[PDB]
């Protein structure tokens, strides 16, 4: 029986929560990921840093669909991210869709993920999650949005941001280039430029993972005949689609 | 077995203090300052966000000021994630009370409940306390306008003017100097911003580093209105009170 | 048939002695006053086991109360311990109709009717059982607050006799108690067979019956 | 639908003398119109000079006796081998019975022995544990045939002194154990004649200060 | 609460001078359908006990597994498992009786009537009955179901009381048992011709006979029976 | 740290040994068993003169035939007394008789080793349990937080105990009257108490077969103190 | 040392110190002897008083008509274990109409003690027991340690100075095993064996505790004047 | 569930978590109780590091447990709320089942029992609170005053004080309280109580609270003015 019913994260004399600080350090080591909000979309992007070349890195998905209009990326511990994605997909249903018959708005799904992360910071016998998330989404009444969630459970909305390794440089790069009139293609172009700085090796469609929240894709719905159902706004760009935009770089 | 790794979060020191409560209070002293001031015709809540960025989406951002119901709001100093756990609980208690009695929850009954929840984490369960101090601003028809604070011990007290977070010693001295009982909400607004202006660790006080709210019976006839100020409205009241 | 009433000298408790299963008279020597403690009496009607079991249990709770509080339990408190208990069991099929009788300094002589459907009634005169209506007639028409102890005892005896005569399921013998502030006093067992003839002669009542 | 109860017939009888007590029972066990056994003992020595019979549904009767025996064992373990007195045994059995108040032992229990002054004692229980000390008690099938007889012949009910025509009761003399046993045998002989479930054998357990003795008599087997 | 589905009819038994005999037919009925024709309802436990079971067959198969598991368990950490600490008939019975009463008390009976027949360590005959209600009893002869109504009267003419037991040889007892089985075959509509018989003797141990048949049957007189009153042809 | 149920290298339970230390700091309690009764006396030890000393309750009725005196962390005794009272009353409910003094004592002692990681620590109080039953007459037991109980002809517990026990060793004999036992308890309490013994800072009680357990009035004890003073002044 | 904080920790040489410390509590206990013939089994126990005003602490506990034991060490632990034995003897009688074999009782005690040696939060039992009984295979004597080791013996002793008694019984083995049909002689050999472990004090009438069980002898305990005969 | 034995014995027989609970009591604002002949007064110190405090709404230091009994305390304020809630629930439960309100002693015994339980239950720490509980038993005119502490011991007092500097004010009460003649009026009792706090308080300003409890559920808190007249008259007799 789990006999660790006491907190493993506690306050030190200086007021610090050590385990949260250390989770944040694990995030700091993580591969860079970023997101940029345009007027008509959001882009999230990261590097697919393949662990061996015998690994098939398209089978490792760092950018994840949470709902048809919400996607997530991370920096830090991959396995922690994968389980959070499973829980986030589920909670979108159990605490929202099965009640209201519609997917949650971005900010409330973020809220639910954040709560899960907060509880790993206070509940008995567990450590905090060693990841920061960037969550991009659209919903009818709030439009496009982009949030960061940290190991403490704190979340903040951004116009554009970066997390992980090269984030201090990437954020300065983004402050120069961001304005409130970017069109989604502009934000994609800026994302690719920003991401090049933190990437050492190969830089192409097979080593970059990029997704957008944009227009509804009726072609990805899987059925026709219900006028109000127009398709998911989340879309992962292909290897080829990324490379096309890398000549325009 | 597992005992070896237990910090024992709910023990007295030899001086009869609660270690984790004391250390949570130390954490809270580095949070952005929040101020509440109670006037005869309403209440002001003013709080400083922690060092921003130009890329932060301010108009969709909330980190200090939260609505508990239509008559009660809080200002937060400390761990934001911890605060949201408690805030959602308080929102539920308020609705439970409304459902049971068909009357809005009196401010103190809400405050006492949240404070009892905090107290429990200091006495049983072996969990760390919530790293949060609240200022509660609200109205009910028994006591009218009221200000309370609570902290990680679950202790709460009522105030005419109060601060929490960073530099409360300096802030409190300044409030005590200029506060007067017959003061009005528009006067209280100015006192709150002047006080933040002087105690801030920032170079200057600008709209993008503030959150601001008033609770006024400046809602037409015997009824109360909460106003969480938009970024542009914070910008205007900074100019109008001549801080920018 | 069981009865209890309050008067200037305390409380009279009087009961018959008969238990039946259908028409079969199982016993004529049943003890229908349960001696809860030296200051408290309860009467048996309904289920014999439910009354016995829970009223001697009541005696245990009364004893614990006075150990903890260093004071005699009130009749109010004692009766409520029983009624709260049976109320917990409501619907499960307990059968009980009882008078909890005592005489304390704070209350004076006190009687509570307690019942398995959770009723708890304070009053001056109660009568419970298949013969209760016969007992009430005699009680109601002769009762006064200012009866002497001797006349009160006789009245209680005479009322059970009335019931024993007319009610097929009442009889055997009459048990009498007098409850004072200093405890109850037993006033003996009176065979109804002998009592009936004796009362008929001395009183001239029951002219309908040939003796 | 499953019926958890049955009726195994049987008739039992306990009588308290001045310094002795007897508990008697027939040894026939039946269901419906069949005989299961002509000799299935139903009165038991439980230790500490206590005898017991739980008449009615034999499965419940056996379970209760077994439990009581066990309770005697644990009373010795828990209270320094103190002898379980008959009044204490009786209260204890009330609690065993009332513990199954809402799914009762379908039996009429009688125990016999001597009280703490050496006087004969009999206690009688209903199926859910109300009890009383008694001088005389028959239980089971032929109880209604036997009790009126004992009222008349043990307590001298309705007998008056010749010559007084009802003015002076026949005075209540004490019966010897030989006398009591005669009344027991005639009780069962009579019950055997008129009740189909009574017969085969009569086993009497006699309790005195010297311990527990047994006697057995044949009854008619038809 | 349930209801018996596949069922076995009578078990019959008696004591004789040196042991006990027990018998039961080999049928498992399904209501009035005589469904299963090679069912063994006498189950030996070791070399000193035979448990005979009537009533529900699914419950019989359960009890049979309980008994087998009892033997396994008794042997655990028991150097004297095949000597002084072998299972006695009386241990096996008390265990079954405990289980039966417990199951009835939970309103979920094992729908059976059971006779445990055997010989104890000291040579004493053991014969005792228990059923779905937890009712138990002993007699020099025991039978379940129809056997109680038809076998017992016949068996009691051989051993009518305790003192008859030492006068009853195994030959007289077996013949009495075999005749009773014929009578049940005549008169019980849920009986079969085929049965098993077991003798547990204090000298010769356990003899277990399978595939016995009812024989020497009288049917010839039937040829003369015509109509139901007045018919002559 | 180390478990609450740890043995020391000498084969003793640390926590039990340490509770024994807390008991040594307690006010003194004394009992003396005679063939006419058992006496129980205690030092009240009020911490200030404004404390109303008749609110100090260190002698306690368990049943009519059983009394109890305590020494140590006396707040710990309340659940022990509650248990003892429940056990005495429960036994009478089940058996229609008085429970034996030893059986009652054993039942209290069964509580004691029920601590672990059940209560979180041993009790920090010792009890003198005195009473009468028909089988073993007048009895006095000493119940410890180790779960052991010893029967005694006389016994002292608390801070004055080994001075008091030496005294009791010398003064006890099998013919003491009740009156003699009362004076003896008073005299030994007077000996080992810091303050001057009087009727407001010591308390007496007895249990007799006839009258059961009784705590003495202050007026009654005052008389016995006076009578003690005069017998001492008379040699 | 760093390995003796709880029962769930092996030392680097594979030892269990909390169990060894539990064993140490038995060693401080007052001596008790057990021995048997082929018809009887006997317990003798030297009881300990607290002082001259106090009773002598009882050492012998009856478990059933055919079984009982004596203790050395923590007495409340003996009460827990003997209570468990009573229940198991009882269960065997009620369910199987069968007297619990002494060997089976030993196995049950071993397993009950073992659980307190392998889990967090428990502590081992701090008591040793000598169990005698008479069952279907005759007279038996068992020694129980709270490590959970249970051993069948002709004779033994446990407690302070038990070594003297134990050596005596080792020499006498061929004599006492043959004391069949004479309860008093077996007890004498028992009182003699226990005498090899006394110093300073000797066997008095409130000091001495004897129990016996055998062929036609329910487990019975002798104390007080009933042991004067053997003093 | 979290089960850890936090209150345990030390080698010298001390339970340090209970002793440290008392240290929390020592730090709390001073509280005093004094019984007159027909009343009881409870006085409480208010630490004056807090102006801008709203005194209408700030939790008061004396709490009604029922209409005839009050409780004050020194120590952890948050802890005291837990005991006050439990005591109020128990007071109503006693009325419901016994059909009589609690005696002051019964209520004290209950609160003290809760405090003790928290010194030997796994996973909890002791209350950092001592209490003064005062009032009148139903239909009784004899005044009652009891004290409890973190260990769960309780006792009755003619007058008593707890919290910081209570050594000093107990000093004062022991020299100024005569048992043979208790403060025979409300006035005398309230004056003796304000005097005792003036040994320790500072300004007799809104530093001192006073609550009077009389028989028959007659309970009232004095205001700043009425206390001020006591403060005033006390120092004017001083210069002499
Ligand atoms: Mg109740
Ligand atoms: Mg016939």
Contact, H47 vs H29, CB < 8 A? yes
Q: Burial level of B92, CB count in 10 A (0-12/13-18/19+)? A: exposed
Touching C (3+ Cβ pairs <8 A), the chains are: D, F, H
| Phi–psi pair at C174, nearest 5 degrees | -105, 130
Q: Which residues in chain C touch residue D149, judged by CB atoms under 8 angstroms apart?
A: none
CA distance H88 to F164: 45
Q: Assign F20 to helix, strand or coil.
A: helix
Name which of F61, F9, F59 is nearest F29 in CA terms: F59
Q: Which of A135, A129, A93 is nearest to A111 (CA)?
A: A135
Residue G76: name the closest of A16, F143, F96 by CA. F143
B174 phi and psi, to 5 degrees?
-65, -40
Q: By what technique were these coordinates determined?
A: X-ray
Question: Which own/partner pairs from B146-150 qualify as long-range (CB within 8 Å, at least 24 positions apart)?
Answer: B146/B38, B146/B43, B146/B107, B146/B108, B146/H54, B146/H57, B147/B36, B147/B37, B147/B38, B147/B43, B147/H54, B148/B107, B148/B108, B148/B111, B148/H57, B149/B36, B150/B111, B150/B114, B150/B115, B150/B118
Please state, in angstroms and rounded to a whole number, the distance separating the CA atoms of residues D143 and D191. Answer: 9
Q: Is H99 on the interface with C (CB under 8 A)?
A: yes
Catalytic residue positions of E, numbered: 1
Looking at the DSSP bridge assignments, the partners of residue B218 are none
Domain borders along chain H are 1-240
Closest CA to D204 of D15, D19, D23: D23
Extract the tokens encoding D147. Answer: 């009790």
Interatomic CA distance for residues C120 and B223, integer angstroms: 49
Q: Does F92 touch chain C (CB under 8 A)?
A: yes
Q: In what order do the strands lie in the sheet with D120-125?
A: D44-45, D51-56, D107-114, D120-125, D131-134
Question: Residue H120: phi, psi to the nearest 5?
Answer: -140, 35
Is any Cβ of chain H less than 8 angstroms from the Cβ of C81? yes
Nearest-angstrom CA–CA distance, D176 and D92: 30
* Distance in Å, alpha carbon of F93 to nearest chain C alpha carbon: 7
Interface subset of B 21-50, CB within 8 angstroms of H: 38
d(CA C87, CA A26): 62
CA C83 to ligand 1 centroid distance, Å: 7
Residue F170's domain spans which residues?
1-235
Extract the tokens encoding G148: 């959970």
Query: In H70-102, which positions are buried (b, 16+ CB within 10 angstroms) versus exposed (e)?
Result: bbbbbbbbbbbbbbbeebbebbeebeeebebbb
Task: Detail the residues of C annotated as belonging to a binding site for bortezomib.
Answer: 48
D29 and E CB contact within 8 Å: yes
Taking the C-alpha atoms of residue E167 and residue E159, their distance in angstroms, rounded to an integer, is: 9
* Spatial contact of B21 and B152, defined as CB atoms under 8 Å apart: yes
Give the SS3 label for residue B133.
strand
Phi and psi at G194, nearest 5°, equal -70, -25
Q: Can you name the CATH fold of G1-231? A: 3.60.20
**Neighbouring chains to H with at least 3 Cβ pairs closer than 8 Å:** A, B, C, F
CA distances from F7 to A193, F12, F22, F111, G200 (A): 68, 5, 19, 19, 29
CA distance E26 to E32: 15
Nearest partner of G81 among G130, G27, G47, judged by Cα: G130
Secondary structure letter of residue H30 according to DSSP? P
Assign residue C174 the CATH number of its domain: 3.60.20.10
Q: What is the 3-state secondary structure (H, E, C) of B26-67?
A: HHHCCCCCEEEEEECCEEEEEEECCCCCCCECCCCCCCCEEE
d(CA C4, CA C10): 11
Does residue E209 contact residue E197 with C-beta atoms inside 8 Å?
A: yes
Residue of E nearest to D32 (CA): E149
Closest CA to G187 of G49, G67, G40, G46: G40
Phi, psi of B90 (to 5 degrees): -70, -40
- What residues of chain B lie within 8 A of the CB of G121, using their CB? 1
Q: Which of E169, E163, E178 is nearest to E209 (CA)?
A: E178
Partners of residue C24 on adjacent β-strands: C21
Instruction: Determine the distance separating the centroid of ligand 1 and the alpha carbon of C66, expressed in angstroms.
Output: 15
Given the structure tokens 């609460």, which residue do they identify? Answer: E1
Closest Cα partner for D69 from D44, D86, D90? Answer: D44
Spatial CA neighbour of G156 closest among G49, G45, G19, G3: G45
Rg (chain C; Cα; Å): 17
C:58-97 residues touching chain F, CB 8 A cutoff: 60, 63-64, 67-68
CA dist B239 and F31 (Å) reads 86
Q: Which ligand has an atom closest to residue C83 CA? A: 1
* Closest residue by Cα to residue C63 from F210, F88, F69: F88
Neighbours of C141 (CB within 10 A): 7
* Closest Cα in chain A, distance from residue H46 (Å): 29
Specify whether the CB–CB gap between G222 and G210 falls below 8 A: yes
Closest CA to D47 of D7, D8, D86: D86
Domain range for C29 is: 1-211
Give CA–CA dist A110/A90, Å, rounded. Answer: 13
Q: Which of A2, A5, A7, A125 to mutate to test the interface with B (most CBs of B within 10 A)?
A: A7
Backbone dihedral region for residue D56 (phi beyond 0: left; psi -120 to 50: alpha; all else: beta): left
Q: How far is CA F220 from CA A15, F56, F189, F205, F226, in A?
A: 63, 18, 17, 11, 10
Q: Report d(CA E68, CA E84) in Å as an integer.
A: 19
H-type helices in chain E, by residue range?
A: 57-75, 89-105, 146-158, 170-187
Mention every residue, 6+ apart, whose C-beta is less than 8 A from residue D155: D135, D136, D172
CA distances to A216, D159, G140 from G102, in Å: 81, 63, 7
* Helix, strand, coil percent content, chain D, rounded in steps of 5: 30, 30, 40
Let me know if chains E and H touch, i.e. at least 3 Cβ pairs under 8 angstroms: no
Residues of chain F neighbouring C56 (CB-CB closer than 8 A): 93
Closest CA relative to residue D56, chosen from D95, D5, D103, D131: D5
Collapse the DSSP code of C109 into the 3-class scheme (helix H, G, I; strand E, B; otherwise coil) and give the result.
strand
Contact G120, A3 (CB under 8 A): yes
| Helices of type H across chain B | 19-28, 80-101, 107-123, 168-178, 185-199, 231-240
Distance (Å, whole) CA B179 – CA B172: 10
- Both tokens of residue F217? 């009035």
Residue H23 region by backbone torsions, left for phi larger than 0, else alpha for psi between -120 and 50, else beta: alpha
Report the Cα A133 to chain-centroid distance in Å: 5
| Assigned architecture for domain H1-240 | 4-Layer Sandwich (3.60)
Q: Of how many residues is chain F composed?
A: 235
Structure tokens at H5: 């034995």
d(CA G75, CA F109): 11
> Hey, which residues does C95 pair with through a beta bridge?
none
Alpha helices of E9-75 — where are they, by DSSP H?
57-75
- Alpha-carbon gap, residue H137 to E79, rounded angstroms: 74
Can you read off the two tokens belonging to residue E188? 């019980």
Q: Computed over its alpha carbons, how large is the radius of gyration of chain F? A: 18
Token pair for residue G10?
């092996």
Of H90, H84, H156, give the one whose Cα is nearest residue H127: H84
Return the HEC string of C22-52: CCEEEECCCCCEEEEECCEEEECCECHHHHH
Class (C level, CATH) for D1-222: alpha beta
Are F101 and F132 a contacting pair, CB within 8 Å?
A: yes
Nearest Cα residue to C14 out of C160, C171, C135: C160
CATH code where residue B110 lies: 3.60.20.10
Instruction: Tell me which fold the domain E1-233 belongs to.
Output: 3.60.20
CA neighbor of E66 nearest in space, from E43, E82, E38: E43
Using left for φ > 0, alpha for ψ between -120 and 50, and beta otherwise, residue A78 falls in alpha
Q: How far is CA A113 from CA A110, A131, A163, B129, in A?
A: 5, 12, 17, 21
């Amino acid at each position: 029986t789990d006999r660790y019913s006491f907190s493993l994260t506690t306050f030190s004399p200086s007021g610090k929560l050590g385990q949260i600080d250390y989770a944040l350090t694990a995030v700091k080591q993580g591969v860079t990921s970023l997101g940029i909000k345009a007027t008509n979309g959001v882009v999230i992007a990261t590097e697919k840093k393949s662990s061996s070349p015998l690994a098939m890195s398209e089978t490792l998905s760092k950018v994840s669909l949470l709902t048809p209009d919400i996607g997530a990326v991370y920096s830090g511990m991959g396995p922690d991210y994968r389980v959070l994605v499973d829980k986030s997909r589920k909670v979108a249903h159990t605490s929202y869709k099965r009640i209201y018959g519609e997917y949650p708005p971005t900010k409330l799904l973020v809220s639910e993920v954040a709560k899960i992360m907060q509880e790993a910071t206070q509940s008995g016998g567990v450590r905090p999650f060693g990841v920061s998330l960037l969550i991009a989404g659209h919903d009818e009444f709030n439009g496009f949005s982009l949030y960061q969630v940290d190991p403490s459970g704190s979340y903040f909305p951004w116009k554009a941001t970066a997390i992980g390794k090269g984030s201090v440089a990437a954020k300065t790069f983004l402050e120069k280039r961001w304005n409130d009139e970017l069109e989604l293609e502009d934000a994609i172009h800026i994302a690719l430029l920003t991401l090049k700085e933190s990437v050492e090796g190969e830089f192409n469609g097979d080593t970059i993972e990029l997704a957008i929240i944009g227009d509804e894709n009726p072609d990805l719905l899987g059925y026709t005949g219900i006028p109000t159902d127009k398709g998911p706004r989340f879309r992962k760009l292909t290897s080829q689609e990324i490379n096309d935009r890398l000549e325009a770089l | 077995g597992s005992r070896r790794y237990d910090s024992r979060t709910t023990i007295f020191s030899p001086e009869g203090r609660l270690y984790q409560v004391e250390y949570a209070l130390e954490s809270i002293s580095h949070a952005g300052t929040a101020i509440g001031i109670m006037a005869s015709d309403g209440i002001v809540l003013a709080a400083e966000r922690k060092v921003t960025s130009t890329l932060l989406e301010q108009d969709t951002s909330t980190e200090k000021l939260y609505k508990l119901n239509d008559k009660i709001a809080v200002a937060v100093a400390g761990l934001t994630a911890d605060a949201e756990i408690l805030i959602n609980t308080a929102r539920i208690h308020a609705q439970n009370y409304l459902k049971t009695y068909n009357e809005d929850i009196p401010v103190e009954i809400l405050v006492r409940r949240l404070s009892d929840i905090k107290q429990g984490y200091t006495q049983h369960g072996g969990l760390r306390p919530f790293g949060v101090s609240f200022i509660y601003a609200g109205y009910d028809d028994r006591y009218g306008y009221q200000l309370y604070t609570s902290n990680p011990s679950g202790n709460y007290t009522g105030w005419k003017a109060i601060s929490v977070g960073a530099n409360t010693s300096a802030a409190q001295t300044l409030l005590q100097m200029d506060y007067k009982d017959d003061m009005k909400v528009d006067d209280a607004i100015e006192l709150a911003l002047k006080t933040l202006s002087k105690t801030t660790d920032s170079s200057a006080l600008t709209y993008d580093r503030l959150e601001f709210a008033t609770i006024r019976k400046g809602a037409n006839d015997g009824e109360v209105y909460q106003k969480i100020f938009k970024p542009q409205e914070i910008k205007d009241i900074l100019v109008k009170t001549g801080i920018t | 048939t069981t009865l209890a009433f309050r008067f200037q000298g305390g409380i009279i408790v009087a009961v018959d002695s008969r238990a039946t299963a259908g028409n079969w008279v199982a016993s004529q020597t049943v003890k229908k006053v349960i001696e809860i403690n030296p200051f408290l009496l309860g009467t048996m009607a309904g289920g014999a086991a439910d009354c016995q079991f829970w009223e001697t249990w009541l005696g245990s709770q009364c004893r614990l109360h006075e150990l903890r509080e260093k004071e005699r339990i009130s009749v109010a408190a004692a009766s409520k311990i029983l009624s709260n208990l049976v109320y917990q069991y409501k619907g499960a099929g307990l059968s009980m109709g009882t008078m909890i009788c005592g005489y304390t300094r704070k209350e004076g002589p006190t009687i509570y009717y307690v019942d398995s459907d959770g009723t708890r009634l304070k009053g001056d005169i109660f009568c419970v059982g298949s013969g209760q209506t016969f007992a009430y007639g005699v009680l109601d028409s002769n009762y006064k607050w200012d009866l002497s102890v001797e006349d009160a005892l006789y009245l209680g005896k005479r009322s059970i006799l009335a019931a024993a005569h007319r009610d097929a399921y009442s009889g055997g013998s009459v048990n009498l108690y007098h409850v004072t502030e200093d405890g109850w006093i037993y006033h003996g067992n009176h065979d109804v067979g002998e009592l009936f003839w004796k009362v008929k002669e001395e009183e001239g009542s029951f002219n309908n019956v040939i003796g | 639908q499953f019926n958890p109860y049955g009726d195994n017939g049987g008739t039992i009888l306990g009588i308290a003398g001045e310094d002795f007590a007897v508990l008697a029972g027939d040894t026939r066990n039946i269901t419906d119109y069949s005989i299961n056994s002509r000799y299935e003992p139903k009165v038991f020595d439980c230790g500490d000079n206590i005898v017991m019979s739980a008449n009615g549904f034999a499965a419940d009767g056996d379970a209760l006796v077994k439990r009581f025996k066990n309770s005697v064992k644990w009373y010795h373990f828990d209270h320094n081998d103190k002898k379980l007195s008959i009044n204490s045994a009786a209260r204890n059995i009330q609690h065993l019975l009332y513990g199954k108040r809402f799914f009762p032992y379908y039996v009429h229990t009688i125990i016999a022995g001597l009280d703490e002054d050496g006087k004969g004692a009999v206690y009688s229980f209903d199926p859910v544990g109300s009890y009383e000390r008694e001088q005389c008690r028959a239980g089971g099938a032929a109880a209604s045939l036997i009790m009126p007889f004992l009222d008349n012949q043990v307590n001298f009910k309705n007998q008056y002194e010749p010559g007084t025509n009802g003015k002076v009761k026949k005075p209540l003399k004490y019966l010897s154990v030989e006398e009591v046993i005669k009344l027991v045998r005639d009780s069962f002989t009579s019950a055997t004649e008129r009740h189909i479930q009574v017969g085969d054998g009569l086993e009497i357990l006699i309790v005195t200060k010297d311990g527990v003795r047994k006697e057995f008599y044949e009854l008619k087997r038809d | 609460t349930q209801q018996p589905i596949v069922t076995g009819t009578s078990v019959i038994s008696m004591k004789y001078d040196n042991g006990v005999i027990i018998a039961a037919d080999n049928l498992g009925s399904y209501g009035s359908l005589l469904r299963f024709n090679g069912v063994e309802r006498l189950i030996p436990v070791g070399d000193n006990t035979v448990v005979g079971i009537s009533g529900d067959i699914s419950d019989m198969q359960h009890i049979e597994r309980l008994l087998k598991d009892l033997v396994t368990e008794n042997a655990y950490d028991n150097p004297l498992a095949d000597a002084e600490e072998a299972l006695e008939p009386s241990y096996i019975f008390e265990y079954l009786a405990t289980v039966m009463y417990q199951r009835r008390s939970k309103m979920n009976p094992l729908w059976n009537a059971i006779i445990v027949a055997g010989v104890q360590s000291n040579g004493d005959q053991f014969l005792r009955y228990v059923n779905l209600l937890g009712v138990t009893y002993s007699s020099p002869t025991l039978a379940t179901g129809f056997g109680a109504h038809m076998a017992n009267p016949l068996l009691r003419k051989v051993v009518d009381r305790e003192s008859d037991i030492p006068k009853t040889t195994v030959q007289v007892a077996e013949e009495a048992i075999v005749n009773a089985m014929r009578v049940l075959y005549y008169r019980d509509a849920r009986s079969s011709r085929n049965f098993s018989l077991a003798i547990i003797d204090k000298n010769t141990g356990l003899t277990f006979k399978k595939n016995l048949q009812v024989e020497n049957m009288k049917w010839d007189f039937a040829k003369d029976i015509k109509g139901y009153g007045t018919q002559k042809i | 740290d180390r478990g609450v149920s740890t043995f020391s290298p000498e084969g003793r339970l640390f926590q039990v040994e340490y509770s024994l230390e807390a008991i040594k700091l307690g006010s003194t309690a004394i009992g003396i068993a005679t063939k006419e009764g058992v006496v129980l006396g205690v030092e009240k030890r009020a911490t200030s003169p404004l404390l109303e000393s008749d609110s100090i309750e260190k002698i306690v009725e368990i049943d009519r035939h059983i009394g109890c005196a305590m020494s140590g962390l006396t707040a710990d005794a309340r659940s022990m007394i509650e248990h003892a009272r429940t056990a005495a009353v429960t036994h009478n409910l089940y058996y229609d008789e008085d429970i034996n003094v030893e059986s009652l004592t054993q039942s209290v002692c069964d509580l004691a080793l029920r601590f672990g990681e059940l209560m979180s620590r041993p009790f920090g109080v010792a009890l003198l349990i005195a009473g009468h039953d028909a089988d073993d007459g007048y009895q006095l037991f000493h119940a410890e937080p180790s779960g052991t109980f010893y029967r005694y002809n006389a016994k002292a517990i608390g801070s004055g105990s080994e001075g008091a026990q030496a005294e009791l060793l010398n003064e006890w004999h099998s013919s003491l009257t009740l009156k003699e036992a009362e004076l003896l308890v008073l005299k030994i309490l007077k000996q080992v108490m810091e303050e001057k013994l009087d009727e407001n800072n010591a308390q007496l009680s007895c249990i007799t077969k006839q009258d059961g357990f009784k705590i003495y009035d202050n007026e009654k004890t005052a008389e016995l103190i006076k009578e003690l003073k005069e017998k001492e002044a008379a040699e | 040392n760093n390995y003796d904080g709880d029962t769930v920790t092996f030392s680097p040489t594979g030892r269990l110190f909390q169990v060894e410390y539990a064993l140490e509590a038995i060693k401080q206990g007052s001596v008790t002897v057990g021995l048997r013939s082929n018809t009887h089994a006997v317990l003798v126990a030297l009881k300990r008083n607290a002082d001259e005003l106090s009773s002598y602490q009882k050492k012998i506990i009856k478990c059933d008509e055919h079984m009982g034991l004596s203790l050395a060490g923590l007495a409340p632990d003996a009460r827990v274990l003997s209570n468990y034995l009573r229940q198991q003897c009882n269960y065997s009688s009620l369910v199987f109409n069968r007297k619990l074999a002494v060997e089976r009782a030993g196995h049950l005690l071993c397993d009950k003690a073992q659980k307190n040696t392998q889990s967090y939060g428990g502590r081992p039992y701090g008591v040793g027991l000598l169990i005698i009984g008479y069952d279907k295979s005759g007279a038996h004597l068992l020694e129980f340690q709270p490590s959970g080791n249970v051993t069948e013996l002709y004779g033994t002793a446990i407690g302070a100075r038990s070594q003297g008694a134990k050596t005596y019984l080792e020499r006498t083995l061929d004599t006492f095993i043959k004391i069949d049909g004479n309860p008093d002689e077996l007890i004498k050999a028992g009182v003699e064996a226990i005498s090899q472990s006394l110093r300073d004090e000797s066997l008095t009438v409130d000091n001495l505790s004897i129990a016996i069980v055998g062929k036609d002898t329910p487990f019975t305990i002798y104390d007080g004047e009933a042991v004067a005969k053997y003093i | 569930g979290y089960d850890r034995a936090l209150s345990i014995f030390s080698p010298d027989g001390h339970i340090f978590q209970v002793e440290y609970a008392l240290e929390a009591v020592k730090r709390g604002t001073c509280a005093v109780g004094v019984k007159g002949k027909n009343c009881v007064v409870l006085g409480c110190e208010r630490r004056s590091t807090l102006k801008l405090q709203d005194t209408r709404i700030t939790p008061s230091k004396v709490s009604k447990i029922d209409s005839h009994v009050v409780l004050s305390f020194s120590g952890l304020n948050a802890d005291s709320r837990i005991l006050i809630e439990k005591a109020r629930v128990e007071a109503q439960s006693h009325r419901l089942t016994l059909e009589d309100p609690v005696t002051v002693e019964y209520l004290t015994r209950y609160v003290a029992g809760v405090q003790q339980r928290y010194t030997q239950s796994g996973g909890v720490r002791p209350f950092g609170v001592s209490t003064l509980i005062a009032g009148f038993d139903p239909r009784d005119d004899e005044p009652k005053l009891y004290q409890t502490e973190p260990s769960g011991i309780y006792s009755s007092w003619s007058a008593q004080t707890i919290g910081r500097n209570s050594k000093t004010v107990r000093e004062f009460l022991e020299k100024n309280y005569d048992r043979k003649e208790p403060p025979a009026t409300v006035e005398e009792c309230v004056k003796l109580t304000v005097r005792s706090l003036l040994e320790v308080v500072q300004t007799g300003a809104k530093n001192i609270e006073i609550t009077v409890v009389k028989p028959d559920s007659d309970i009232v808190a004095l205001s700043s003015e009425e206390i001020n007249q006591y403060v005033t008259q006390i120092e004017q007799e001083k210069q002499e």
